[PDB]
Structures are given as structure tokens and as C-alpha cells.
Amino acid sequence: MSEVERALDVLLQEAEELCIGSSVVELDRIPTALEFCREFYSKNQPVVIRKALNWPAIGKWTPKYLIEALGDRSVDVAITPNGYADGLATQNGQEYFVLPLETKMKLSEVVRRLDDPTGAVHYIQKQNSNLSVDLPELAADLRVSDLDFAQQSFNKPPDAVNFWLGDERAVTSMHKDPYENVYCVISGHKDFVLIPPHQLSCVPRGIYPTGVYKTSDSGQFYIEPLRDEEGSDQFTEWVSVDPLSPDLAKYPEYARAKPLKVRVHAGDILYLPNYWFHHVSQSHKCIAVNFWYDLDYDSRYCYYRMLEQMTSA
Amino acid sequence: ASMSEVERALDVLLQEAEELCIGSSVVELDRIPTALEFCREFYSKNQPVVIRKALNWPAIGKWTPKYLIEALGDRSVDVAITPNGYADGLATQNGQEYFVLPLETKMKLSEVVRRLDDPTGAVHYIQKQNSNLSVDLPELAADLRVSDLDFAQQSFNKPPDAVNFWLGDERAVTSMHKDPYENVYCVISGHKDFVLIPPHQLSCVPRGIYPTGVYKTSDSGQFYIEPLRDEDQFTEWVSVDPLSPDLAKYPEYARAKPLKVRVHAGDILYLPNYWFHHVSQSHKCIAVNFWYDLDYDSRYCYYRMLEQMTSA
Ligand SMILES: O=C(O)CCC(=O)C(=O)O
Ligand SMILES: O=C(O)CCC(=O)C(=O)O
Ligand SMILES: [Mg+2]
Ligand SMILES: [Mn+2]
Ligand SMILES: [Mn+2]
């Protein structure tokens, strides 16, 4: 074996022997700030806290309640034919990384489309702090100070507060973010598949042309390639494996990955640490809110960049 | 190629750490931080910090040679002796370079102090490590207050694995090395000068494999090196002298960014796990330090991979 493969084997064997990123820790009570810093933040270790929050939103936010309170609020909604916004899809023999069709519609109309199983897949998934921007009133039904146990490790206000409301057909393909993520389910449940960053060499990634979903004048979906002004394709690096049904013949290295599964119910909190890979599915019309905090860099980022170099094409 | 695949990977590591200035300075505080602050800013970042005039222990001031001699009943203490001042350090004999362990003997503290006052004699250091303050000198603990270190100890969440007492000649130098411990270092009298290099700069720090030896005295009291056997024994050790580095022989060291910090009496230095350190001291400097076993995380695994990539 090559020098690089020997090094990656050392990394993976040491992490397995030491149980690094080998489980999602479960707590039945919110930890102290010091506990959270020592056990989860400092160790880049995910944790789920069960029945942590009793926010008024939990039990009150239903599709009906949201229509009554904010039914006329125009919100950004993503639409795909296949349920994979920010996901891989083929057209005319080429695999693209595809961005969703994005549009504005009344929340009332979104809920109506979520209740139509024969139509396209809709998901309010804008991020970009869309709760603060589009649905600020909903803030009164949250108590963000309850998250201080975690926020004290990040020592900064949230970069973003996002509101999520989606079809059970809407699946979030595996990716990673450069944020600390405090994820709070309000209604329904979310199913996460998580892979730690040090298993990068086990996660196949490719470079794909970028496209966006559009509909034709007759209503058929298609993919429009994104291009620069010069006319050259724009490209996105993206995880190539489907963790729900992995093709081990195409991606034998993924047999060495140890993906973790966690379901997050209403009132639970998930800490999803920076740079962890995550794939997400949801119950139908699941509602969630999450808080993103910019990461504080240390040598783990530098090692991860090295690992990207060692696993590059 | 022009560069190995491993060399290209190491160059990316170093470039990214340089742009972010990882481990580029020892943070200086004038007040002890809260436990949460220490965990967030220093422990979780594997980041050294020096806290100035942090401790008011009675030892800082009471501990003179005479006081220690009284308090310990002129006990026989273990002392390390070398001819050159480099216990656990490189030295050459008969054209061969060895990693040399000190001569270890026991003498009354009164005699140690007498020898520390002889510049023409060999270099003496009380530096037993293991846990020689708790195990071999317990009477001294009454002049400290270890709970004052709780701000740090709460991040480690375990008692010290060792508490060491250090009292040395200004000629005694601790060559550059790393430890698999969190270290809380407390100077009692005098000062210590540290040169520190962060773990991710391992590829810049030259290391060799040397035969192991130990200092012994001849018939006439003069020192020589006896090679150590166990059947041929060898030690991996840092090859560079950080005080006057030979950049012609070790050009990679020009990429390291060593940090200098002087730790005075009453100051605390947190030396995080696996940081390289070289240590010099004032004459008859006294220090105590607390070692805590590390709590493994992803960063340790990456470092083990790095050790494999730079095996040298
Ligand atoms: O809820 C989802 O579908 C995606 C959540 C996600 O990717 C995030 O919180 O970063
Ligand atoms: O004080 C010295 O000479 C060395 C201290 C040291 O190496 C340590 O505390 O780990
Ligand atoms: Mg200084
Ligand atoms: Mn995400
Ligand atoms: Mn040491």
C-alpha cells in the first residue's frame, strides 16, 4: 500500500480503537455549560437531548395554526420533481448537482401543495436565517435563552436561525457545513444519518456540473445548467453515495464508514458539530428550527484540509 | 514527483495552519479565567496560555533552600547529575551521538544545595518527575493550595496523574520533547524560559533515532556514557537545538514558528498535550507542575497519522 493509504489506515484504526465519533450521545437533561463545552464542543461530538424544550411552539405550531397566524405571509419555498433539493440527478446522460426551483408563495398555498401527494415536492428550506427574515413573529413562541448551555461554548449569537417545514418526500442529501448546528424539532420527527469528518476517506465525493430545476411552458420539470458569463459550466463538489442504499460495488471504501442514525422528536435538541456529514429525512409536514454558529478554527480544520488533499483525484 | 504525495499533504497542512496562525502565540492573561473560559478558549483549542501573578501560595516566598532543608528533615532526595547540563539529551562519545539519561543518585538536600553552589562541579537537578512531590515530598503540599487550579482541572475532569517538584542549576537544560499530558506548570521561585512548538509543526522539527546511554562516573569521578542494553537500545529524539538552530543541516526547521515565554514566580503556564517544549531556568529555580492524562479526541488521531507520515 501507498504511503498515503498507510497514513489513512492509521487514522481510521486509531479512531475506531478510541471510539472517536462512534455514537450519538443521549442525554435526558440539559447539561451545564461547562459539561457541554468539555464533553461535546471540545470533542466535536454530537449529542441529542431528549425532551429538552417545552417552548410554546411545541404543541401549538400546526399547519392550521401557521395558516391562521401567518397564512398570508409570502415565504420562499423550494420545489423539486424528485424530492432532492441540493442533490444529484441525471438529464440526457449527465449527472448534475441540482439546486431547487425557488419561488415565493403564500404559506397557505405551500400547505395546500404539501397536502397534494401527486404534485411536485415542496419544502420551506431556505436557511439564510429565514425565521428572523420572513417569520419573525414566530420568535415569540421560542425561548432561545434555553440554548445558553450550548451558546456559551460558541460565545457568539447565532449567525442564522432557520425555519423548516417540508414534505416527507423531501430528503436532504449528505453534506457538511462549516457551522455549529443546534437543531430543535417542533413537530414530527427528523431522521439523521451522520458521518464524522475523520472518515472523509470513506465518503466518495465527485465534481459535478451545477444546474437548477425549471419548468417548461407545458409544466415539465427540467435541469438548466448554470454557466459563467464566458459560457463555461459551473461545478460543485458533492458526496456521491446514497447512505440509505449504498452501492458498495461502486464505492467499496464506504464499507469502512460507520454512519450513525439518530431520530430527533419534538422537543429534542440535536447538536450537530461543525464539518460532520449529515443526510436528513423527515416525517410529513415536520416543523423544525435550527441555529447556526460560525466555527472557531483550530488545528482540526487544518488536518481536515490535509485529508481532503490526501483523498483528492 | 517534484514532491511526494505525503509531502504535498504536509505542505497543505502547514499552509492552512500558517494562514490561520494556529498556535502562533501564547495568550497572556492577568486574571485567572473561569472554568468555562478555560475550557472554551484554551483546552478545546489545544492552546497555551500564561497567567501572570495568578498564585499567592505561601510557598512563593517561603521556599528557600534553608526552608526546604528544615521542612524535609534534610531527607535524602533523588538527584539527577550530568556533566553537560543535558539530562535526557544528546551527547557525543567516541564519534557516536547518544541520547543520554542522567546519573541518578540520592543525597541529603544539604549536599545538593552545596553542589548547586559549585560552578566548577557537575550539573545537579532535582527533577524526578513520576509524581515526586506527592509521593516523595508530601510535607510541601501544606504550602500550596491545589484547588486554585480548579479553573483548569474542571476541563480535564480528573485528578492529576502526577505532581512534580523541580529544583535545578541554571546550567540544567531540558532538551526539546513532547508529553502525552495536559500540563499546568507553576513557578515558585525564579523563572523558567520555554521554547514551544505546536504539534501540527511536527514535520518541521527534525527527529533522529539514537542509541540510548546513561551517564556514569569513572574511577576518578569523571563522567562517561555507558550504552544501554536489553538483550542495542534506541530512542527517537528531537535533533535540533532551538537556542541556536543549524538551518543548513535542518532547513525544514526554518518553517517552524517557535514561541518564547518566560514564566515568573506566581505565574501559571498551561502547556497543552503534545506541544514540543524546551526549558531553561534561573539558578536554583523551583517549580511544581501537574500532569493530567489526555482525553482522546479526533485531534489526537490526526496527530498519530501525522507521526506516521513524518516517521523519521
Ligand atoms: O432539515 C433538513 O432537511 C436539513 C438540515 C440541515 O442540513 C442543517 O441543519 O444544516
Ligand atoms: O522544568 C523543566 O526543566 C522541564 C519541565 C517539563 O518538561 C514538564 O513539565 O513537562
Ligand atoms: Mg514572556
Ligand atoms: Mn446542513
Ligand atoms: Mn515535559
Coordinates of all heavy atoms in Angstrom, one line a residue, chain A residues 220-257, unseen atoms left out:
Chain A
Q220 N -43.4 20.6 -17.6 CA -42.5 19.5 -17.3 C -41.2 20.1 -16.6 O -40.7 21.1 -17.0 CB -42.1 18.8 -18.6 CG -43.3 18.3 -19.4 CD -43.0 17.4 -20.6 OE1 -42.3 17.8 -21.5 NE2 -43.4 16.2 -20.5
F221 N -40.8 19.4 -15.6 CA -39.5 19.8 -15.0 C -38.3 19.5 -15.9 O -38.3 18.4 -16.6 CB -39.3 19.1 -13.6 CG -39.9 19.8 -12.5 CD1 -41.3 19.5 -12.2 CD2 -39.3 20.9 -11.8 CE1 -41.9 20.2 -11.2 CE2 -39.9 21.5 -10.8 CZ -41.2 21.2 -10.5
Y222 N -37.3 20.3 -15.8 CA -36.0 20.0 -16.4 C -34.9 20.7 -15.6 O -35.2 21.5 -14.7 CB -36.0 20.4 -17.9 CG -36.1 21.9 -18.2 CD1 -34.9 22.7 -18.3 CD2 -37.3 22.6 -18.2 CE1 -34.9 24.0 -18.6 CE2 -37.3 23.9 -18.5 CZ -36.2 24.7 -18.7 OH -36.3 26.0 -18.9
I223 N -33.7 20.4 -16.0 CA -32.5 20.9 -15.3 C -31.9 21.9 -16.3 O -31.6 21.6 -17.5 CB -31.5 19.8 -15.0 CG1 -32.1 18.9 -13.9 CG2 -30.3 20.5 -14.4 CD1 -31.3 17.6 -13.8
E224 N -31.6 23.2 -15.8 CA -30.9 24.2 -16.6 C -29.5 24.3 -16.1 O -29.3 24.6 -14.9 CB -31.6 25.5 -16.5 CG -30.9 26.6 -17.4 CD -31.6 28.0 -17.3 OE1 -32.5 28.2 -16.5 OE2 -31.1 28.8 -18.1
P225 N -28.5 24.0 -16.9 CA -27.1 24.1 -16.4 C -26.8 25.6 -16.0 O -27.2 26.5 -16.7 CB -26.3 23.7 -17.6 CG -27.2 22.8 -18.4 CD -28.6 23.4 -18.2
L226 N -26.1 25.8 -14.9 CA -25.6 27.1 -14.6 C -24.3 27.3 -15.3 O -23.4 26.4 -15.3 CB -25.4 27.2 -13.1 CG -26.7 27.2 -12.3 CD1 -26.4 27.7 -10.8 CD2 -27.8 28.1 -12.9
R227 N -24.1 28.5 -15.8 CA -22.8 28.8 -16.5 C -22.4 30.2 -16.1 O -23.1 31.0 -15.7 CB -23.1 28.6 -18.0 CG -22.8 27.2 -18.5 CD -23.8 26.8 -19.6 NE -23.6 25.4 -20.0 CZ -24.4 24.6 -20.7 NH1 -25.5 25.2 -21.2 NH2 -24.1 23.4 -21.0
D228 N -21.0 30.4 -16.2 CA -20.5 31.7 -16.1 C -20.8 32.5 -17.4 O -21.3 32.0 -18.4 CB -19.0 31.6 -15.9 CG -18.2 30.8 -17.0 OD1 -18.7 30.8 -18.1 OD2 -17.1 30.3 -16.7
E229 N -20.4 33.8 -17.3 CA -20.6 34.7 -18.5 C -19.9 34.2 -19.7 O -20.3 34.3 -20.8 CB -20.2 36.1 -18.1
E230 N -18.7 33.6 -19.5 CA -17.9 33.0 -20.6 C -18.6 31.8 -21.2 O -18.1 31.4 -22.3 CB -16.5 32.6 -20.1
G231 N -19.6 31.2 -20.6 CA -20.2 30.1 -21.1 C -19.7 28.7 -20.6 O -20.2 27.7 -21.0
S232 N -18.8 28.8 -19.6 CA -18.2 27.5 -19.1 C -19.1 27.0 -17.9 O -19.7 27.8 -17.2 CB -16.8 27.8 -18.6
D233 N -19.3 25.7 -17.9 CA -20.0 25.1 -16.8 C -19.5 25.5 -15.4 O -18.3 25.6 -15.2 CB -20.0 23.6 -16.9
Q234 N -20.4 25.6 -14.5 CA -20.1 25.8 -13.1 C -20.1 24.4 -12.4 O -21.0 23.6 -12.8 CB -21.0 26.8 -12.4 CG -20.8 28.2 -12.9 CD -21.5 29.2 -12.0 OE1 -21.0 29.5 -10.9 NE2 -22.5 29.8 -12.5
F235 N -19.2 24.1 -11.5 CA -19.1 22.8 -10.9 C -19.2 22.9 -9.4 O -18.8 23.9 -8.8 CB -17.8 22.1 -11.3 CG -17.7 21.9 -12.8 CD1 -17.2 22.9 -13.6 CD2 -18.1 20.7 -13.3 CE1 -17.2 22.7 -15.0 CE2 -18.0 20.4 -14.7 CZ -17.5 21.4 -15.5
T236 N -19.7 21.8 -8.8 CA -19.9 21.6 -7.4 C -19.3 20.3 -7.0 O -19.6 19.3 -7.6 CB -21.4 21.7 -7.0 OG1 -21.9 22.9 -7.4 CG2 -21.6 21.6 -5.6
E237 N -18.5 20.3 -5.9 CA -18.1 19.0 -5.3 C -19.2 18.6 -4.4 O -19.8 19.3 -3.6 CB -16.8 19.2 -4.5 CG -16.3 17.9 -3.9 CD -15.0 18.1 -3.1 OE1 -14.0 18.4 -3.7 OE2 -15.1 17.9 -1.9
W238 N -19.5 17.3 -4.5 CA -20.7 16.8 -3.7 C -20.4 15.3 -3.3 O -19.8 14.5 -4.1 CB -22.0 17.0 -4.5 CG -23.2 17.0 -3.6 CD1 -24.2 16.1 -3.5 CD2 -23.6 18.1 -2.8 NE1 -25.1 16.4 -2.6 CE2 -24.8 17.7 -2.1 CE3 -23.1 19.3 -2.5 CZ2 -25.4 18.5 -1.1 CZ3 -23.7 20.1 -1.6 CH2 -24.8 19.7 -0.9
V239 N -21.0 14.9 -2.2 CA -20.9 13.5 -1.8 C -21.7 12.6 -2.8 O -22.9 12.9 -3.2 CB -21.5 13.3 -0.4 CG1 -21.8 11.8 -0.1 CG2 -20.6 13.9 0.6
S240 N -21.1 11.5 -3.2 CA -21.7 10.7 -4.3 C -22.5 9.6 -3.8 O -23.3 9.0 -4.6 CB -20.6 10.2 -5.2 OG -19.7 11.2 -5.6
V241 N -22.4 9.2 -2.6 CA -23.1 7.9 -2.1 C -24.5 8.3 -1.6 O -24.7 9.3 -0.9 CB -22.2 7.3 -1.0 CG1 -22.1 8.2 0.2 CG2 -22.8 5.9 -0.6
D242 N -25.4 7.3 -1.7 CA -26.7 7.4 -1.1 C -26.7 6.6 0.2 O -26.7 5.3 0.1 CB -27.8 6.9 -2.1 CG -29.2 6.9 -1.4 OD1 -29.3 7.3 -0.2 OD2 -30.1 6.6 -2.1
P243 N -26.6 7.2 1.3 CA -26.4 6.4 2.6 C -27.6 5.5 2.9 O -27.5 4.6 3.7 CB -26.2 7.4 3.6 CG -26.8 8.6 3.2 CD -26.8 8.6 1.6
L244 N -28.8 5.7 2.3 CA -30.0 4.9 2.5 C -29.9 3.6 1.7 O -30.6 2.6 2.1 CB -31.2 5.7 2.1 CG -31.6 7.0 2.8 CD1 -32.9 7.5 2.3 CD2 -31.6 6.8 4.3
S245 N -29.1 3.5 0.7 CA -29.0 2.3 -0.1 C -27.6 2.4 -0.8 O -27.6 2.6 -2.0 CB -30.1 2.2 -1.1 OG -30.3 0.8 -1.4
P246 N -26.5 2.2 -0.1 CA -25.2 2.5 -0.7 C -24.8 1.4 -1.7 O -25.0 0.2 -1.5 CB -24.3 2.5 0.5 CG -24.9 1.7 1.5 CD -26.4 1.9 1.3
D247 N -24.2 1.9 -2.8 CA -23.7 0.9 -3.8 C -22.2 0.6 -3.5 O -21.3 1.3 -3.9 CB -23.8 1.6 -5.2 CG -23.3 0.7 -6.3 OD1 -22.7 -0.4 -6.0 OD2 -23.6 1.0 -7.5
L248 N -22.0 -0.5 -2.8 CA -20.7 -0.8 -2.3 C -19.8 -1.4 -3.4 O -18.6 -1.4 -3.2 CB -20.8 -1.9 -1.2 CG -21.5 -1.3 0.1 CD1 -21.5 -2.4 1.2 CD2 -20.9 0.0 0.6
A249 N -20.4 -1.8 -4.5 CA -19.6 -2.2 -5.7 C -18.9 -1.0 -6.3 O -17.8 -1.0 -6.7 CB -20.4 -3.0 -6.7
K250 N -19.7 0.1 -6.5 CA -19.1 1.4 -7.0 C -18.2 2.1 -6.0 O -17.2 2.7 -6.3 CB -20.3 2.3 -7.4 CG -19.8 3.4 -8.3 CD -21.1 4.1 -9.0 CE -20.7 5.2 -9.9 NZ -21.9 6.0 -10.3
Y251 N -18.6 2.0 -4.7 CA -17.9 2.7 -3.6 C -17.5 1.8 -2.5 O -18.1 1.8 -1.4 CB -18.8 3.9 -3.1 CG -19.3 4.8 -4.1 CD1 -20.7 4.9 -4.3 CD2 -18.5 5.5 -5.0 CE1 -21.2 5.8 -5.3 CE2 -18.9 6.3 -6.0 CZ -20.3 6.4 -6.1 OH -20.8 7.3 -7.1
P252 N -16.6 0.9 -2.8 CA -16.2 -0.1 -1.8 C -15.6 0.6 -0.5 O -15.8 0.1 0.6 CB -15.1 -0.9 -2.5 CG -14.6 -0.1 -3.7 CD -15.9 0.7 -4.1
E253 N -15.0 1.8 -0.6 CA -14.4 2.4 0.6 C -15.5 2.8 1.6 O -15.2 2.9 2.8 CB -13.7 3.7 0.1 CG -14.6 4.8 -0.4 CD -14.7 4.8 -1.9 OE1 -14.7 3.7 -2.5 OE2 -14.7 5.9 -2.5
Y254 N -16.8 2.9 1.1 CA -17.8 3.3 2.0 C -18.1 2.2 3.0 O -18.8 2.4 4.0 CB -19.1 3.7 1.2 CG -20.2 4.3 2.1 CD1 -20.1 5.6 2.6 CD2 -21.3 3.6 2.4 CE1 -21.1 6.2 3.3 CE2 -22.3 4.2 3.2 CZ -22.2 5.5 3.6 OH -23.2 6.0 4.4
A255 N -17.7 0.9 2.7 CA -17.9 -0.1 3.7 C -17.1 0.2 5.0 O -17.5 -0.4 6.1 CB -17.4 -1.5 3.1
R256 N -16.1 1.0 5.0 CA -15.3 1.4 6.1 C -15.9 2.5 6.9 O -15.4 2.8 8.0 CB -13.9 1.7 5.6 CG -12.9 1.9 6.7 CD -11.8 0.8 6.7 NE -11.0 0.8 7.9 CZ -9.7 1.0 8.0 NH1 -9.0 1.1 6.9 NH2 -9.1 1.0 9.2
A257 N -16.9 3.2 6.4 CA -17.6 4.3 7.1 C -18.5 3.6 8.1 O -18.9 2.5 8.0 CB -18.4 5.1 6.1

